[PDB]
Design a protein around this ligand. Structure first.
Ligand code: LDA
Ligand code: LDA
Ligand code: LDA
Ligand code: LDA
Ligand code: LDA
Ligand code: LDA
Ligand code: LDA
Ligand code: LDA
Ligand code: LDA
Ligand code: LDA
Ligand code: LDA
Ligand code: LDA
Ligand code: LDA
Ligand code: LDA
Ligand code: LDA
Ligand code: LDA
Ligand code: FE
Ligand code: FE
Length: 647
């Protein structure tokens, strides 16, 4: 119930709720959260290794405006210098839950906090041995792509009587989606451990080996799209990479009033691939190394008629990179490789020191949590070809305050203001932008909401306001930084679920639920785009649906819907011939599912068949600045089957 007690916008979706929609990816689960926009694979991330998602209208491309973690470990192969998840070493099949925090935690978590912190919770180590396995297969009947897409997960673990536990988590993907040239292969292997010799000392560890490769469909011009919206006109495009992670943690807790925690992690990441760029085809190998140590201490003490849970923490993180780009002439058939001309050879790095200190105070029905995070960051960029060495160092004080008032025994009110900031990225240390120089990005967020729950009606609603000093794009075609200027994000986020049986035995076990968010993301920067709408930001988005669980059966019906959106800061309504620019329409989709549980006992065998986009409703999205810009056919009627086994 921590979320119910959270002084800010927050939503956690637990594993038992993934399957409801036949969600096989992270994106498909995040999309169902109010205020979260996780678009279909497109642009640089036109495949399943990357992750595209943004909240409250923040650029959703490569989830670069959010602090995304896994069990507290930074997922980005470069948390400060390049937050972009062209490669996302995470998998839905290994998580117990997905915790999204849009407001209320920009103190303990940073740095790219402006767009909420998303924490993926890894499956727990079996209390006393256990096995679980699942698999889904999808087919796109109307698509020309006949290769199916199957994903699978495996969990083998247990805990010895000596307090030692270890779980083997394995998630894998294979197949192609509804687009031609999208064959994928992902293998997510993790070794998780925990050793609690007694009840004061406890150790944990995480070892991961992620390896993947996927063909990228790419966008289509309008002519091609109309001709055959399934095809791919980007034959050379392909992405791949592997991540090796190691994390060791320790916890000392002598009593219920004192807790000390320290964690150290290390990640080595490699992500590259081929890509048609202009008249050249390129191979871009990029390697990253991350090291960080993070001790933190909390103490609970009572001063009079109030309890004070003071929290203090530090974090040292060090990252280094190395990126190169080999090339050939697209004119030739030849695909680039080692021992070909290269035109980019850089090595960047960052060393960050982050300090945070907060104090949760419970006084009567209140719970005030003043907080403070401060970060001193120093990054560099050594260009081996030009020979230049550029360095930057800045500080980021980030005050914050969270108040929560318990209206009643099952209804809260909240308000908060956190500070967030996006570091200056490597890809922009140069600083080639019309507004003078590039970054850092400072932003202040204000929220106000209420959360309600009573075992029959669970609902929530909240308002938000975010001011950003600036925001920079990418434009991969000409290697330049697209400014935009100050932007403001204001809106409302809400959702609810209700047990209709509470109204009549006729609808016993029938539950309805809806989620909605109004988002107004505007560009306040004085100029030519002043007043325009931030790109890829639907003013209206949400879901609705009804679950019916009679006996061992489970019937699900659901809908997704959203309004139109723009593709460029210029807010061009008229589509271009290459289909990269223009207005993107809204749409409403419908999906359904039927599932049965043979003897919940026995072997917890679960079976299920369903459909996505039942009415084969047509729609699309555009990639504006990426090298494979163009129209991307949205997902058409898709059939799928699921299987679950628990021992
Ligand atoms: C790799 C998984 C193979 C699954 C075999 C099942 C075929 C997928 C078709 C799902 C059936 C959907 N439904 C409701 C329309 O019948
Ligand atoms: C317990 C089953 C878990 C399967 C472990 C799968 C191996 C992961 C290693 C990736 C190697 C991929 N490959 C084909 C490129 O060699
Ligand atoms: C290859 C052996 C790994 C040795 C690297 C040295 C680790 C020193 C880092 C301290 C880790 C502290 N702790 C408990 C937070 O994990
Ligand atoms: C007894 C309290 C001391 C524990 C405080 C935790 C250590 C954090 C201090 C690290 C100092 C880092 N550095 C290089 C930036 O000075
Ligand atoms: C127990 C807290 C551990 C904090 C240790 C603080 C690390 C600061 C080390 C600065 C030296 C960095 N380096 C790699 C460039 O040598
Ligand atoms: C031994 C710990 C005492 C060191 C003070 C660090 C607490 C973290 C507070 C962050 C605010 C830092 N400051 C000075 C820039 O305001
Ligand atoms: C039986 C005594 C209960 C104590 C009631 C004390 C109320 C103090 C009001 C706290 C208001 C805090 N603030 C800044 C958020 O408005
Ligand atoms: C209203 C309660 C005060 C909360 C303490 C947090 C500091 C808020 C000050 C940030 C103002 C930022 N700015 C430039 C946008 O005006
Ligand atoms: C039935 C008794 C009515 C009690 C109303 C008292 C609630 C005080 C309202 C201030 C709470 C503000 N907020 C958003 C920070 O929680
Ligand atoms: C009484 C504190 C409750 C928090 C509600 C305060 C919202 C004030 C929002 C105005 C922020 C304006 N701005 C641009 C200067 O940041
Ligand atoms: C069906 C239960 C009726 C309970 C009567 C209590 C009314 C509480 C008001 C609901 C709170 C709604 N919400 C989302 C706006 O916070
Ligand atoms: C003048 C611009 C004002 C914009 C009005 C947009 C707010 C629409 C939000 C309605 C929320 C409805 N509800 C109950 C479903 O949450
Ligand atoms: C007394 C038994 C009659 C039950 C009343 C059935 C109405 C519940 C609605 C069925 C849910 C259908 N589905 C697949 C769309 O979720
Ligand atoms: C006046 C407020 C605007 C309300 C529009 C609400 C969003 C409904 C979702 C858009 C679905 C559009 N359509 C026809 C393509 O399905
Ligand atoms: C249109 C697809 C329908 C397939 C539904 C798949 C669920 C497996 C069938 C469960 C039958 C259970 N049993 C024992 C009650 O007959
Ligand atoms: C090296 C790749 C081999 C991966 C095999 C992974 C095992 C997952 C199998 C899921 C079994 C699902 N179920 C219920 C249908 O039996
Ligand atoms: Fe890129
Ligand atoms: Fe790039």
């Amino acid at each position: 119930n921590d979320v119910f007690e959270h002084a800010g916008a927050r939503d956690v979706i637990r594993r038992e709720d993934f399957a409801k929609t036949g969600a096989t990816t992270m994106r498909e689960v995040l999309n169902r959260i109010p205020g979260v926009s996780a678009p279909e694979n497109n642009g640089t991330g036109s495949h399943d290794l990357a992750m595209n998602f943004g909240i409250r209208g923040l650029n959703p491309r490569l989830a670069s405006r959010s602090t995304v973690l896994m069990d507290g470990i930074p997922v980005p192969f470069a948390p400060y210098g390049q937050p972009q998840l062209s490669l996302a070493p995470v998998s839905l099949g290994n998580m117990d839950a997905i915790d999204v925090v849009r407001g209320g935690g920009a103190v303990r978590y940073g740095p790219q906090s402006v767009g909420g912190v998303v924490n993926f919770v890894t499956r727990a180590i079996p209390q006393d041995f256990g096995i679980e396995a699942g698999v889904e297969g999808q087919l796109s009947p109307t698509s020309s792509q006949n290769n199916p897409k199957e994903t699978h997960n495996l969990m083998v673990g247990g805990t010895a009587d000596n307090g030692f536990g270890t779980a083997l988590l394995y998630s894998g993907t294979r197949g192609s989606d509804w687009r031609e040239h999208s064959a994928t292969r992902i293998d997510d292997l993790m070794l998780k451990s925990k050793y609690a010799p007694d009840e004061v000392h406890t150790f944990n560890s995480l070892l991961q080996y992620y390896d993947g490769e996927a063909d990228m469909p790419g966008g289509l011009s309008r002519a091609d799209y109309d001709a055959d919206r399934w095809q791919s006109t980007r034959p050379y495009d392909r992405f791949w990479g592997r991540r090796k992670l190691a994390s060791l943690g320790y916890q000392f807790q002598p009593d219920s009033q004192h807790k000390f925690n320290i964690q150290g992690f290390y990640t080595q990441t490699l992500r590259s691939g081929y890509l048609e760029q202009g008249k050249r085809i390129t191979l871009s190998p990029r390697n990253y190394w991350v090291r960080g140590i993070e001790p933190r201490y909390s103490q609970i003490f009572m001063i009079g008629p109030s309890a004070h849970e003071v929290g203090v923490g530090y974090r040292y993180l060090n990252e280094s990179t190395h990126e190169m780009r080999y090339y050939t002439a697209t004119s030739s058939g030849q695909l680039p490789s080692g021992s070909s001309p290269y035109d980019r050879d850089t090595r960047s790095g960052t060393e960050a020191h982050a300090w945070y200190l907060d104090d949760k105070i419970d006084i009567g029905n209140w719970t005030i949590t003043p907080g403070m995070r401060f970060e001193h960051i120093e990054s560099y960029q050594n260009n081996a070809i030009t020979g230049t060495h550029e360095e930057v160092s800045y500080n980021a004080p980030l005050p914050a305050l969270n108040v929560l008032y318990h209206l009643t025994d099952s209804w809260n009110l909240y308000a908060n203001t956190e500070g967030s900031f996006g570091t200056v990225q490597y890809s922009q240390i140069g600083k080639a932008v019309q507004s003078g120089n590039v970054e850092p990005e400072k932003a202040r967020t204000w929220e106000l909401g209420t959360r309600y729950d009573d075992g029959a009606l669970t609902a929530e609603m909240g308002l938000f306001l975010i001011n950003f000093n600036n925001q920079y794009d990418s434009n991969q075609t000409n290697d330049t930084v697209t400014a935009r200027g100050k932007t403001r994000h204001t809106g409302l986020e809400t959702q609810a679920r209700y047990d209709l049986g509470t109204l009549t035995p006729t609808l016993d076990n029938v539950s309805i639920y809806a989620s909605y968010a109004y988002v107004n993301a505007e560009i306040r920067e004085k100029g030519d785009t002043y007043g325009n709408l931030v790109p890829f930001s639907p003013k209206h988005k949400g879901t609705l649906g009804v679950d019916y669980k009679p006996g061992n059966w489970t019937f699900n019906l659901n809908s997704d819907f959203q309004s139109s959106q723009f593709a460029d800061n210029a807010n061009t309504v008229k589509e271009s011939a290459d289909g990269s620019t223009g207005r993107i329409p809204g749409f409403m989709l419908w999906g359904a599912r039927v599932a049965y549980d043979f003897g919940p006992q026995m072997a917890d065998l679960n079976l299920a068949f369903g459909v996505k986009n039942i009415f084969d409703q047509d729609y699309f999205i555009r990639s504006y600045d990426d090298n494979n810009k163009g129209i991307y056919a949205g997902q058409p009627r898709t059939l799928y089957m699921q299987g679950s086994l628990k021992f």
